[PDB]
Amino acid sequence: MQFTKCELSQLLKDIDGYGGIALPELICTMFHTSGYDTQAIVENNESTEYGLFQISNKLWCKSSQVPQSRNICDISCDKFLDDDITDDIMCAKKILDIKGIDYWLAHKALCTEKLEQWLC
């Protein structure tokens, strides 16, 4: 599923403030990693990040690439490529509670200040 920035801002209204993340920070990361496409994948040599929230199989979900993964979200990574971002949000909240905003922002400085362009 492909979303617009406004569609997605409405679906994610609830996660705003969760664990200290701001919705526009999220939308910034999403624009750059998926173009708001729930089927996006970003590959690294060892691991892969899936879907809108770019959730890694290194730790967070089960995938044949990384059979040793801790699978902290107790879910197949395939669920992060479907059209239902509900499970993705569940796992992103776990990420926020365990790792925090750094998961998305530590290496995406542009999405940590001057964020007016991400408002609907």
Shortest CB 1 distance to Ca ion, Å: 9
Among 7, 16, 84, 102, binds Ca ion (CB under 5 A): 84
Q: Which tokens hold the place of 120? A: 């609907």
Q: Is the Cβ–Cβ distance between 18 and 93 less than 8 Å? A: yes
Task: Output 76 or 112, the one with its CB closest to Ca ion.
Answer: 76
Dmax (CA) of the chain: 40
Q: Any contact of residue 88 with Ca ion (CB under 5 A)? A: yes
Q: Does 49 show up as a binding residue in the annotation? A: yes
Task: Output 84 or 97, the one with its CB closest to Ca ion.
Answer: 84
Residue 94, C-beta contacts closer than 8 angstroms, at least 6 positions apart: 60, 72, 73
Residues lying near Ca ion in the complex (CB under 5 A):
79, 82, 84, 87-88
